């Protein structure tokens, strides 16, 4: 009767932040490799 | 010229390993989101009915 | 001096990418734990009542 | 009454693909390190 | 000889960090799968009964 | 009536082991980079 839905789409879109800003250092490293 | 070339290629392979890991995390997001929607849209309404 | 400097900086960027991945995994733990607590504390008692 | 089970074992075995083919580049890098 | 050795060892440590991350993802799969089986085998039958 | 709670906090604290002992090789690499 008092069952509200769970919403973690806050931390999930936190993970998706961490992942995109990993991908944009990876393209940083591969910048310095293409430098060599 | 040979050692620097090899080191550069080693870093390139490591980056490709990280990219595959990044793809794993992206799919992990989809899996967790799928569980959330199933609980909110199928389980919770089934209990309230 | 230029190639070794560049390789060192390339490894530094790769490590920063791994650190962001490590932060992703930490938040994944929080998300999964949040689903567990919701099932045990909200769903299970609602079915037993 | 119309509650079908959830099956994401599709994306999970997608993750387990990405992870094994990461592990098989890692063994690629450590190939070139053992090269040096 | 000293800088190339050090760079090679730095890449080796980074790969070990990625390997530990790969182990984290493998366990994340087990955790998510555990939640799925619990919902399908314990929650869903409890609601249908 | 026979619904015990799910407890995977075993594998979760397995993940949190793998992650901390990744972070403590990362600080290993960045040791050898600060070496150069």
UniProtKB/TrEMBL annotation, chains A, D, F:
It is found in: Virion membrane; Host cell membrane. It comes from the Viruses. Signal peptide: none annotated. Belongs to the paramyxoviruses fusion glycoprotein family. Homotrimer of disulfide-linked F1-F2. This is Fusion glycoprotein F0. The chain holds residues 449 to 484 of 539 of the full protein.
UniProtKB/TrEMBL annotation, chains B, C, E:
Residues 1-24 form a coiled coil. It comes from the Viruses. Belongs to the paramyxoviruses fusion glycoprotein family. It is found in: Virion membrane; Host cell membrane. Homotrimer of disulfide-linked F1-F2. The lineage of its organism: Viruses, Riboviria, Orthornavirae, Negarnaviricota, Haploviricotina. This is Fusion glycoprotein F0. The chain holds residues 141 to 189 of 539 of the full protein.
